[PDB]
C-alpha cells in the first residue's frame, strides 16, 4: 500500500514536471536560428600524429597552456606529449594496466588516473628529484573509475561504476562529498566554468546537475534512449551536450530545464563516445564508433564536417583552451591533432 | 635559449623512447587472459591452484608468461567494463556443472558482442564430479530445465573416460553441445571456443589453457598470411 501510493505520487510529480516543461516551451531552437547564415563547409587537417603508445588509448586531457597533453593507454602507461614539437615529456608506468580515465591539473603540477582498480591515483610532476612518483591513492569507490577532473590542487571530482560520484580532499585520502541518485553507471562528468556545478551522465539514459558545495542533485535531464557516454558544458555554462549509444547527440539548457536540439542522421547507427564544444560553442565535435568524428553546427543542427584519420574507434577527443586545435585519440594507439 | 632547451627535450625524448622500446619488448612477450565466472562456478579453487576491483596472477608454462585477471568488487552490470578486455589472448569462462541457462545467456552475449567478436573463449565446465554424483543419485534431473535432453543422443565422436556410466557422459556432452550450438551459430572463422571437462583440483588445467592459447596464436598467424 505504501509503495503503490509512493509510486503514484512520484508519477504525479513527473506529470507536473513534464507539464511545466511543455508550458515553458513556446518556440524551438530550429526556428529561432533559421534566419542566420549557415556555417558552411569546414575542413580540418591533421597536423601532428602522436606515436609511442602500445595499446588502445582510453582518455586524454589538454593542459591549461594548450601545449601539453596527457594520454592514458591500457598497456599501463601515462604519456605527456608536447603537441608543438611532438616530443614526449613524461612516461609514467601504472600499477594497474586497466586505466579508463586521466586528468590534467589546471596548475600543471599534478596528474590523475583511474580504472578497474577502483583507486584514483594522483601523480606529482614537479618533484624535487625530477622523477614522477605517485603522490596519492584515493580509495573508497566500489566500482571502476570512469572519469576524474580537478577542481584545484587539493580537490578532485570522480565518477565510478557504483552509480555514485565523489568529491575528495587531497593530502587526507577521504572523500568529503558523495553524490547519489544515479541508477546506472556514471560514464562522464563535466565541470562548469565557475566550478560551482557539474553535470554527470549515467547508464540510465539520464544526466544530473550537482552543486559541488552543498552536494545535492539540482536538476535531472532525460530524453536519451540508451546509455550516455559523453558530456560537455557549453562555454557560457548555461547549457551542455550529451552523447549516447542511440547514435544521437542532444543539447540541454539549464535554465530551460529541457532538451533544445538533437543532432543525428539516418546513416549514423553507431553510438557516441566523446563530445566537446569549440571556443565559441558554434561547432560541436563528437567521436563515433565508426572510426570517424563529426563536427555539427550546434545552432542549426547541420553537419559541418567529418574528421576521418583513425583506423579504430575514437575513444576520446578534446579542444584546447584557446580553441586552436582538437586532439583525438583512438583504439589504434595513435593520437592526432586536427586544425 | 632555444637550442639548449630543444636539445634537452631531444635527450629526454630518446630516453623515453628507449624505455618504451624495453617496455614493448616486455609487453609483447606476455599473454593476457580474462577469467570470468557465471557464479558459484568454483573458479576460486582454480585460482588457488594457479576494496580492489581486479586481481592479477602471473604464471609461467614452458618459459611462456601468462597474466590472468579476475574481476572483483565490480557490479553485475558488465556491459561497460568488459570492452576493456577486447585484446586479451583469451577469456576463460568457467561454468558450474537455473544457473546453467544464465551462464549460457552470458556466453551468448559475450560471443555476439562487437568488441569481443574476434576474442576466443576457453570454456571450463567445472564440477564434473558434482554433476556425476547428482546424475548417479537421480534426485535432480536436466529434463525439467532442458526438455530436449529427452531426445538427446550421445554423439559417436564422444570419448568417455573408463569407468564412466553412459548417463553422466550423455549429460556432460549435452551440456557441452548447449554451448557448442551458440558458439557455432556465429563466428565465421574469427574466434573459436575450446570446451573442456574439468574439475576444480586438476593440475592439467594449467596445461589445457597452454594447449589452447598456442592454437589461437597459430590461427592468428594463419590469418596474417591468408592461409586459413
Amino acid at each position, epitope marked *: 500500500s505504501e509503495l503503490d501510493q509512493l509510486r503514484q505520487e512520484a508519477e504525479q510529480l513527473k506529470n507536473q514536471i513534464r507539464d511545466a516543461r511543455k508550458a515553458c516551451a513556446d518556440a524551438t531552437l530550429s526556428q529561432i536560428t533559421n534566419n542566420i547564415d549557415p556555417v558552411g563547409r569546414i575542413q580540418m587537417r591533421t597536423r601532428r600524429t602522436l606515436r609511442g603508445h602500445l595499446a588502445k588509448i582510453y582518455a586524454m586531457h589538454w593542459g591549461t597552456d594548450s601545449r601539453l597533453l596527457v594520454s592514458a593507454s591500457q598497456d599501463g602507461k601515462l604519456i605527456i606529449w608536447d603537441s608543438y614539437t611532438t616530443n614526449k615529456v613524461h612516461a609514467i608506468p601504472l600499477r594497474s594496466s586497466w586505466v579508463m580515465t586521466c586528468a590534467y591539473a589546471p596548475s600543471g603540477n599534478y596528474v590523475a588516473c583511474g580504472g578497474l582498480d577502483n583507486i584514483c591515483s594522483i601523480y606529482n610532476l614537479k618533484t624535487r628529484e625530477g622523477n614522477v612518483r605517485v603522490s596519492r591513492e584515493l580509495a573508497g569507490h566500489t566500482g571502476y573509475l570512469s572519469c576524474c577532473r580537478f577542481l584545484d590542487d587539493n580537490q578532485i571530482v570522480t565518477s565510478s561504476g557504483d552509480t555514485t560520484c565523489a568529491l575528495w580532499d587531497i593530502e587526507t585520502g577521504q572523500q568529503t562529498t558523495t553524490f547519489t541518485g544515479h541508477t546506472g553507471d556514471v560514464m562522464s562528468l563535466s565541470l562548469a566554468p565557475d566550478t560551482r556545478l557539474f553535470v554527470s551522465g549515467a*547508464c*540510465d539514459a539520464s544526466a544530473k546537475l550537482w552543486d559541488v558545495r552543498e552536494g545535492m542533485c539540482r536538476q535531472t535531464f532525460t530524453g536519451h534512449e540508451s546509455d550516455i557516454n559523453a558530456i560537455c558544458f557549453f562555454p557560457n555554462g548555461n547549457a551542455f551536450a550529451t552523447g549516447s549509444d542511440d547514435a544521437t547527440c542532444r543539447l540541454f539548457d539549464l535554465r530551460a530545464d529541457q532538451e533544445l536540439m538533437t543532432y543525428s542522421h539516418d546513416n549514423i547507427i553507431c553510438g557516441i563516445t566523446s563530445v566537446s564544444f569549440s571556443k565559441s560553442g558554434r561547432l560541436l565535435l563528437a567521436g563515433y564508433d565508426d572510426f570517424n568524428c563529426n563536427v555539427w553546427d550546434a545552432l542549426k543542427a547541420d553537419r559541418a564536417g567529418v574528421l576521418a584519420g583513425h583506423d579504430n574507434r575514437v575513444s576520446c577527443l578534446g579542444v584546447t583552451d584557446d580553441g586552436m586545435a582538437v586532439a583525438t585519440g583512438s583504439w589504434d594507439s595513435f593520437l592526432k591533432i586536427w586544425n | 635559449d632555444q637550442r639548449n632547451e630543444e636539445k634537452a627535450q631531444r635527450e629526454a625524448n630518446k630516453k623515453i623512447e628507449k624505455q618504451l622500446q624495453k617496455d614493448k619488448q616486455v609487453y609483447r612477450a606476455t599473454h593476457r587472459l580474462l577469467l570470468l565466472g557465471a557464479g558459484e562456478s568454483g573458479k576460486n579453487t582454480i585460482v588457488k591452484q594457479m576494496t580492489s576491483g581486479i586481481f592479477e596472477t602471473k604464471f609461467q608454462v614452458d618459459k611462456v608468461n601468462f597474466h590472468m585477471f579476475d574481476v572483483g568488487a565490480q557490479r553485475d552490470e558488465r556491459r561497460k567494463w568488459i570492452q576493456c578486455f577486447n585484446d586479451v589472448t583469451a577469456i576463460i569462462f568457467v561454468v558450474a556443472s537455473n544457473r546453467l541457462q544464465a551462464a549460457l545467456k552470458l556466453f551468448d552475449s559475450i560471443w555476439n558482442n562487437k568488441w569481443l567478436r574476434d576474442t576466443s573463449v576457453i570454456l571450463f565446465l567445472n564440477k564434473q564430479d558434482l554433476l556425476a554424483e547428482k546424475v548417479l543419485a537421480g534426485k535432480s534431473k536436466i529434463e525439467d530445465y532442458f526438455p530436449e535432453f529427452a531426445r538427446y543422443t550421445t554423439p559417436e565422436d564422444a570419448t568417455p573416460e573408463p569407468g564412466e556410466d553412459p548417463r553422466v557422459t550423455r549429460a556432460k556432452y549435452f551440456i557441452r553441445d548447449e554451448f557448442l550450438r551458440i558458439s557455432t551459430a556465429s563466428g565465421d572463422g574469427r574466434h573459436y571456443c575450446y570446451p573442456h571437462f574439468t574439475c576444480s583440483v586438476d593440475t592439467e588445467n594449467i596445461r589445457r589453457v597452454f594447449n589452447d592459447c598456442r592454437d589461437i596464436i597459430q590461427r592468428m598467424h594463419l590469418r596474417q598470411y591468408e592461409l586459413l
Partner: nanobody
Amino acid sequence: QVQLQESGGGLVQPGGSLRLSCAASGFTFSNYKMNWVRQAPGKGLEWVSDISQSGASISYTGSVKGRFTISRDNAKNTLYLQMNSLKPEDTAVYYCARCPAPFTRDCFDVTSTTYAYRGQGTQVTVSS
C-alpha cells in the same frame, strides 16, 4: 524518458491461462530487442523469454518452452506474453525488459538486480 508499464496478471487457479502486456514509451520500440523475465519469491531474477526487433527470432527458457508465447507489435509499441497451463511454480513477479542499445545482437544486464530499462512487473500467483 524511457518508460515500460506492465499490465495483466493476478491470481489464477492451476491449469489456467493469462496474457501479460508491456507498453513502451520514450524510445523507438521497433529497433529494440525485448525480453520477459521473472523473479520468484525468495529467489533471484530469472530470464524467461526474448524476442528480436522484427519478431523473427524468438527464444524461451526450458521450463516454459512449450507453454509460453512471446510476441510484439510495433504499430502500438507493445509486447505480449501469453501463458498457458499455469502451475504453482510460475508464481512470480514478471518484468518486461529492453536491451541497453539498439541495432545490437546481444543483450546484457537484463537479469541484473538493478536495471534502468526495466519496468515494474506484475504479480502472477497460481494457487487454489
